Amino acid sequence: QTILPYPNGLYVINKGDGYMRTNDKDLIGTLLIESSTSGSIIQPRLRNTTRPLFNTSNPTIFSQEYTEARLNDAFNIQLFNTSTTLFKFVEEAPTNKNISMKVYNTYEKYELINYQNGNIDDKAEYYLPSLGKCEVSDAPSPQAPVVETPVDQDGFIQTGPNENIIVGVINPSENIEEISTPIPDDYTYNIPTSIQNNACYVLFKVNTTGVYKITTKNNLPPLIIYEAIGSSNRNMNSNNLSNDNIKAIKYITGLNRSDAKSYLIVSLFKDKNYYIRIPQISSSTTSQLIFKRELGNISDLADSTVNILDNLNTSGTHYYTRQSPDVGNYISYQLTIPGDFNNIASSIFSFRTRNNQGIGTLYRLTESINGYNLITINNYSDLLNNVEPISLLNGATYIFRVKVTELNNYNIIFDAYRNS
Amino acid sequence: QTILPYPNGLYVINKGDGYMRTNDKDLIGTLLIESSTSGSIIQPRLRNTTRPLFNTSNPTIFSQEYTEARLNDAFNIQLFNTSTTLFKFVEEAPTNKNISMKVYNTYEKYELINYQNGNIDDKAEYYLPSLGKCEVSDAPSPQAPVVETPVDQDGFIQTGPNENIIVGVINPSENIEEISTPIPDDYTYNIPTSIQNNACYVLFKVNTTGVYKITTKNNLPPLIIYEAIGSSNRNMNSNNLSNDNIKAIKYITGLNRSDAKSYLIVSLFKDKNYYIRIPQISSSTTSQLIFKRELGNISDLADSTVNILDNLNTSGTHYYTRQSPDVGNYISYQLTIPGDFNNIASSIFSFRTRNNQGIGTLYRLTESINGYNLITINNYSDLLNNVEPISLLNGATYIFRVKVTELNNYNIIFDAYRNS
Amino acid sequence: QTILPYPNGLYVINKGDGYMRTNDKDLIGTLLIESSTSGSIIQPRLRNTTRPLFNTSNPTIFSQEYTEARLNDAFNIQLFNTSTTLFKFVEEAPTNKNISMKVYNTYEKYELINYQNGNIDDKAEYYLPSLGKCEVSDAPSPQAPVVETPVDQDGFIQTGPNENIIVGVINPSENIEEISTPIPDDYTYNIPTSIQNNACYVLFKVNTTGVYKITTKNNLPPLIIYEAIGSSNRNMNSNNLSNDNIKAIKYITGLNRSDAKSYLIVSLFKDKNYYIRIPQISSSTTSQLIFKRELGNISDLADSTVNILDNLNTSGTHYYTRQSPDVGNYISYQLTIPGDFNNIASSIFSFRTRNNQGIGTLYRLTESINGYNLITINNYSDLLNNVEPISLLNGATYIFRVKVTELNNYNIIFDAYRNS
Amino acid sequence: SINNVNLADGNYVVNRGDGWILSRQNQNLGGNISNNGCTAIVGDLRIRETATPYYYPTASFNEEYIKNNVQNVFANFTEASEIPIGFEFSKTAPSNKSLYMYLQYTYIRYEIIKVLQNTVTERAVLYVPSLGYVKSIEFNSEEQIDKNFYFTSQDKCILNEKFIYKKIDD
Amino acid sequence: SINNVNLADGNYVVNRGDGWILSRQNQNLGGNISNNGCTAIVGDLRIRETATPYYYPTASFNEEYIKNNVQNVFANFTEASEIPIGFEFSKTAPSNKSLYMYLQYTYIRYEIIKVLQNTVTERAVLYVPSLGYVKSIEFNSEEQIDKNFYFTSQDKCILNEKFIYKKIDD
Amino acid sequence: SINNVNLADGNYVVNRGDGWILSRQNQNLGGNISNNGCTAIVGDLRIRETATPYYYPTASFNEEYIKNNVQNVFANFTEASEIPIGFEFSKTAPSNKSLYMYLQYTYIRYEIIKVLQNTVTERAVLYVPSLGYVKSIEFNSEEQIDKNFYFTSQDKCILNEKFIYKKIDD
Ligand SMILES: CC(=O)N[C@H]1[C@H]([C@H](O)[C@H](O)CO)O[C@@](O[C@H]2[C@@H](O)[C@@H](CO)O[C@@H](O[C@H]3[C@H](O)[C@@H](O)[C@H](O)O[C@@H]3CO)[C@@H]2O)(C(=O)O)C[C@@H]1O
Ligand SMILES: CC(=O)N[C@H]1[C@H]([C@H](O)[C@H](O)CO)O[C@@](O[C@H]2[C@@H](O)[C@@H](CO)O[C@@H](O[C@H]3[C@H](O)[C@@H](O)[C@H](O)O[C@@H]3CO)[C@@H]2O)(C(=O)O)C[C@@H]1O
Ligand SMILES: CC(=O)N[C@H]1[C@H]([C@H](O)[C@H](O)CO)O[C@@](O[C@H]2[C@@H](O)[C@@H](CO)O[C@@H](O[C@H]3[C@H](O)[C@@H](O)[C@H](O)O[C@@H]3CO)[C@@H]2O)(C(=O)O)C[C@@H]1O
């Protein structure tokens, strides 16, 4: 029931092992092990058949086969209803007492969800047959008084250690484009016309490790970037991007909000493969994807969406609702102060956030024939209650970085209050 | 070669486990386990086939299939020549010496017998394949001098713990009648005409737990009652006797002697099923089976055949030969003293037994509109040598209870000596 | 590369177990066993197939099937490319560290060679699949620096304990003759005409244990005798030689050199079977094989080829090149001193050897109507450097026995130096 | 007695617990004999082919009624039976004595009861093959053994009996 | 980086060592739960039918090129796959705690590299199914677990990585 | 010698005991190598398909005569061969040394002897496959091993030989 700091799309969540149904529906058997005796229960796989459990909120789309395909994309699971993997439990009773050995079949719970704007519109639960659970305790008394006990509710209980591993997968309904040649320091990619019909992903790799600025020529639409999990250090070709069809993706940074004029600043490694999801444009004019390696401390924003702020030449509040990064992650805002430039001319601003708490860093963006450069103007250990004002030079450009420290809501609200 | 205190019929006797043939005919193998080494011999059931051994005194009737069917009736054995049950032995030799590990196949000996009047007229021995025997001992010396030893006699030796469990089974050639409704405090059952052709069993259950008097209207023929082993606490219906076709029967009380005028007094539990075997009548007149729940200390005779004594109005000995109950069990005798009743009028009697020893209890049978009542007149700690006389009121009825303490002979002889 | 003190023929040499190929070509797998955990690698034989390795210097004759047949003759190996024999390794890691468990498939190396005059003209190497090798060591560090290491040379390394067991087999291309009846104290066998076409073996057994003289009527050609390994104490018939077709033979004594005029003196046991290989005669005249049990200390030469020395009536050196017995074994020389007999008449001799070192014993051969008799004349603790002369009676016969103490060369040279 | 329950009127399916052994079937599988510190091991594989359920239906509750109502609330034994499961027991014989152990199957007792006035009017019974149980005893040709060791005259539970119910509808 | 080698120019086949586990396949086989001193055992049989190689070919090195060149110098995994091999792991749960262990396959990483100026220009990769590896952890419904315990984001070797090469000819 | 018996004249079937190993077949099944405290286990299953009897008939006693006369008094090995039986041996290698153990089959030696004047005139021999036996030795590439460890030149019994007879009739 907590917030999920991720972009729209499909996710397979491994919710843990040791799941089993109530009322002993998965009880294999109980052994009464007398003192000075050993007992054992075995799953020998004399038959490789296993019985997965499935549940879905939408049988038409999120069918079992579909869900299984997602699970394969996420964790690369091969076998769903067979196993050659044996499990066995062995227990010796002490000399003084008798022991009770209960063994159950178990499952690993994988949750497939269709996540849209902080909401789950579709959900399926796949229970992958696991390697069992064994409970040993002092044998109960054959004479223990029988207590009429009503059956429990139909369902599952979790028996294994806590686990919640989220793995996003490429949306199978959105096509994958591919930039064959490792992109150099500068590169422009023309988005195919297919973009008018649906969003797509662009798979690529950089020729040189470093920080990169990525965006559409108009900073619109907003871009999202992912890493191809496990794509590093596999087949490689200096003059060509080797494929793995890895459909498992790690969200780096990016947003879905339609009016989030912006560009990305991310750290990219050449030994890895990345995906840039371009939303459905829906225009007859050709859009472009521009890549540019940045030298300099612009890397301070590494892995962050830089949101360009609009309508600043007014007084008071200036709210900007955006999908919140996870605790510890960044989200940036670019500000070109209204008015012409001349050192002395300035305007008073008060930076603040409203839903989630975080740590802020104010930078002065400067140009050089050696690339960009950021000068730290100030830092904020409390953004939700910041009241400290700051004067900024008119006609100058500032970037405000927010590191989330508290994820209270799906969206993080940024307020660039203008005092004057 | 000892006495078998049971009524005529079929019995399956489990004579124990660990039986094997002589001359190593069942030797599987020997392992020489060197010091600081472990050895193991396994019956993995890679093949489920087992080889039972059979022997019969009458192949025509007591054939192997017939015997197997009896074994199923007695112990409910399912598999006779197959097994999925594994057995294995593991032994580690010490650091100082070598160990010899011998493993043999074994059998459980089931004896099927046709018991008639203290005699076995037919016999079959079924050897059910068992779970082996392992003998470990210090390894013999490879140099030990060889001793010419003549082979032993062909046969079986017992290797397991002592055991002799007797289980009687319904005679498959005698039909089973069934009183569907749980009998109330009083009930009369008309014996079908089929009784003229052969003995039968009447399966029933009482609606109320308690003591019951059961007999034929003329106290002839004598009745025998059994309990259906394991019939308790299974399927039940307050208005109907649920069946289990349980052919395994536990002899409660009853005799076969044709002239044993009598009636039974037994404790019956409603959660159990019972069988009353009615001998072959052989008359055109319809016989009846009367049941009556008794309230009162008549229960003192609980589970006993009450033999009505005849020809008492004479002097001296009055012998009554009857099949002897097992040690600890009862056998009773009813006596209506010759002559008319009037407190003072009496006759002297000396109770004694001749084959088996026992403890006697003399009761005075009395009537009440609240049922019967017994008054203890005397007790005897020695019946075989009792010389103590007792005067009994003429025209009065007495019941003498004998608890067997020594089973020397198939029959127990009761002597109601009349002194006057 | 050492000397092989054996007659011409075929030999199967078990060169040891634990052979495996380089570069982990036989690596089955490695297990990383965490502390307080046990790991196990198993060859369950869920499939009985094994993959033998073969190599030959002559595919035409020493083919794999041929070699396998020799291996069967030598060690009686039944299965070459299948096994029902399981092997498994179990290891528990201590509480303090992690253990590495490496398991490899292995082979037993059997070498088949065609040995001719101290030379191997043909050779085949058969690698019989074995029961594996397990190496446990402290788990290496996942961070251990990677060292570029060039692959090793293609080949085999020996991992098991040192072993070199030589077993000769009957040459399958030379026929086997058989003396059916156990030979008595005296026996003459006529060599069939087949001998003109190729060498043959004569299988037989003596009726009485003892020492025997065996030879051709002209002491030519030289004979070789073998024992049929494992032929003792099996099927027997006092009036007939029972066969086992045992093709595995143990070389007792004998030579191949064409001009080695001689006869054998060997100890024979009746419970065993022996083979005498008669070379290809190549003459139209019938040859004979004479057997004679010897009573007396002629047994001192037991298991030795007695070489009759020729051309002695000259001065100086008298060299005799012969195939050398193995260290500890004998080779004898018979000398009838040139000249007529008359106690006083004598000649000076100096016995010496040249290639191999040994211990010598000089005997005076004497006749008796009770058989022969040897009188020790002298002994020599050093033959290679013996300078001590000895005077021998002319017209008398002496036998010189050499026990090899140093096998430096295929041939042992005997020098019967005549001083006068 | 065993018919007095504290439940509203109606029909119920009850889980009487695992660990039930059946009347007189004690030694049907055979026994094992070892001595002088040897370790003895017996086991089995309740393969559908062998392990078959024992039904004891009544008028109101036939086999099918019992099965479907049990497999609906509790473990579906019909499906599970397709997958072989094993169990074993091991024990070491004493230094200078003999050890005897015999094996028998255990079951889960299920019941279908008809209630009326807090009393069971009808009772159907089902025994679903579970695993197994072994009994041991040390001995020598001399010793006399209590026959109850070898024989069970009435079905019973080697663990604590249970009463987990659910009212049946329709 | 990982592309700097000290080898003459040319194509090489390299044995990167045994003990490689693959990205995010950690729990594909399932996990095992035990407690209070119970011994838990998990194992498997890399039967050809299941254990299949993972190929990552390049332009200069296709699947066939990789296979033949690996099986020529190193263990022929195609032949070996015909013979079933087993492996198991066992561990005893602590006295009053729970134990969780999960199993995953291990592999032998083989590489086909194109060298030019002491730097790898092209690199093909092959993972030959080897045996298996288990990871354990003690727990109770409370504890929070480091997610790296359950997930491997990048292929890695649980043993020391290796670099055993041989220049390819023809 | 071995032909002097104290029996009336006639033909006898004799049980020479279990534990017989055959000449030079010592290493036919292969050997196992382990080290540093590792536990090594080797075993087998004398499945009829493999374990075949070794007959050594004489004039008076052919194969059939031997079989029928053995299986009549002693264990019927022809029937038993239909049921697979297993055996295993395990041993732990020393802390810092290597262990080598090899396996071979054991047999029951049966004999059919013709007696005349307290001496065996004819002797037929049969070896019925029994179980197995392992021999161990510690080592290091240096050590030299007694070759008798690896080779048995004459059939022998690893246990005490026996002589259990029965005069044959007809
Ligand atoms: C300084 C300022 O103008 N802040 C706005 C921001 C920014 O303009 C925006 O983030 C671009 O940087 O927008 C806020 O949200 C409104 C904005 O997204 C507009 C864009 O169309 O939509 C409004 O909601 C619409 C909605 O899109 C329609 O579907 C619906 O039918 O009508 C709604 C009318 O309210 C957003 O509220 C923001 O929170 O970022 C508002 C700030 O004041
Ligand atoms: C007091 C008294 O009369 N005692 C008898 C008893 C009782 O009469 C009897 O137990 C009824 O209560 O009988 C004794 O045995 C004889 C009795 O059973 C009669 C009945 O027919 O048979 C005698 O044997 C017969 C046998 O039945 C025939 O098959 C056979 O051809 O002839 C026999 C003639 O002896 C019994 O001996 C008893 O011991 O209970 C004898 C008492 O004296
Ligand atoms: C005392 C004496 O004469 N010693 C000889 C011995 C003996 O004559 C021989 O051992 C018989 O007892 O022979 C030595 O070797 C020569 C001998 O074998 C002759 C026999 O033909 O052959 C010589 O070699 C031949 C060879 O056989 C031919 O194939 C070849 O073409 O020509 C060779 C000519 O040298 C042996 O050298 C011996 O060492 O025993 C020589 C002694 O002097």
Swiss-Prot record, chains D, E, F:
Stretches for region HA-22-23 domain 1: 1-170
Superkingdom of the organism of origin: Viruses
Protein name according to UniProt: Hemagglutinin component HA-22B
Residues of the full protein shown: 15 to 184 of 623
